[PDB]
């Protein structure tokens, strides 16, 4: 019920999608997106630091974390907590590195607020095929457990 | 009004405090705490990576990010956004490294969910005196701007 309650707050439903996915000046392929919410979306990383490295971003392009409205802060953060639960179940881990590079001097390369979620294990470039496969595994799991 | 609205959601008021501040097996000195909310608190770091390095944690000891309730996730994350605004104004920066080491394999050393907020600038141990001084500067600024 905790995660089902978060999904209700995120206004999620199976197959919810956006017509387009903007990330800074870039456009994310719909095949790489595993979840869309009222204000955010989650997509697989083309340059993962480690396996299962995912990104969460706002549907509206906003550069800094402090540019987000209260509703967007809640949305992206409830999605983060929900995705750590999903990734935890999929990658068989309880440990994650969660981070925002909020600005150029924090290492931000794309001018659009995003959260990194990286599954972590002891002593730990991708094609559209591998990315679609990874996004499909995540999307399939969300659908199976949450309707 | 955005930040005043967040403070209302955090149930904050000038001088709001807790009888005790637990952080894992450790206890944080009240002099090092700059803000207390309905579910969280913010305190200055005794081993800062860079100047202005602060920590946010839950008042209730919870090990993993996924142990938090919906109300706690919202509280700690609205406080994070609010504190990036405050620290931004105090340390004269728009850039921050924001992170959760969610578990031992992510480098967590204290078994209690916490967010790191580190102000960042181009090409960037503390005594109770220095820590009290830093917490006082933060607390004084919050009070001045938000009542």
């Amino acid at each position: 019920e905790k995660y089902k309650n978060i999904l209700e707050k995120l206004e999620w439903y199976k197959n919810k999608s956006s017509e387009k996915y903007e990330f800074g000046i870039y456009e994310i392929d719909k095949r790489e997106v595993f979840i869309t919410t009222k204000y955010s979306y989650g997509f697989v990383n083309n340059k993962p630091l480690l396996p299962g490295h995912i990104l969460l971003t706002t549907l509206k392009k906003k550069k800094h974390y402090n540019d987000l409205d209260i509703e967007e802060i809640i949305d992206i953060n409830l999605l983060c907590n929900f995705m750590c639960y999903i990734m935890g179940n999929l990658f068989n881990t309880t440990d994650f590195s969660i981070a925002i590079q909020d600005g150029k001097e924090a290492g931000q390369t794309v001018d659009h607020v995003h959260i990194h979620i990286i599954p972590r294990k002891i002593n730990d470039i991708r094609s559209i095929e591998q990315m679609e496969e990874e996004a499909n595994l995540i999307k399939s799991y969300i659908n199976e457990k949450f309707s | 009004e955005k930040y005043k609205n967040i403070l209302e959601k955090l149930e904050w008021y000038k001088n709001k405090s807790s009888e005790k501040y637990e952080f894992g097996i450790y206890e944080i000195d009240k002099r090092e705490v700059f803000i207390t909310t309905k579910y969280s608190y913010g305190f200055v770091n005794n081993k800062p990576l860079l100047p202005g390095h602060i920590l946010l944690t839950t008042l209730k000891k919870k090990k993993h990010y996924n142990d938090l309730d919906i109300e706690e996730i919202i509280d700690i994350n609205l406080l994070c956004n609010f504190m990036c605004y405050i620290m931004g104004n105090l340390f004269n920066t728009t850039d921050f490294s924001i992170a959760i080491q969610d578990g031992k394999e992510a480098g967590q050393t204290v078994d209690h969910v916490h967010i790191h907020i580190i102000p960042r600038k181009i090409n960037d141990i503390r005594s109770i005196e220095q820590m009290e001084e830093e917490a006082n500067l933060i607390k004084s600024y919050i009070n001045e701007k938000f009542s």
Binding site: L49, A99 | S97, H116
Partner: peptide, 7 residues
């Protein structure tokens, strides 16, 4: 950034 994951 650039010394640990993920700073």
């Amino acid at each position: 950034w650039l010394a640990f994951v993920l700073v």
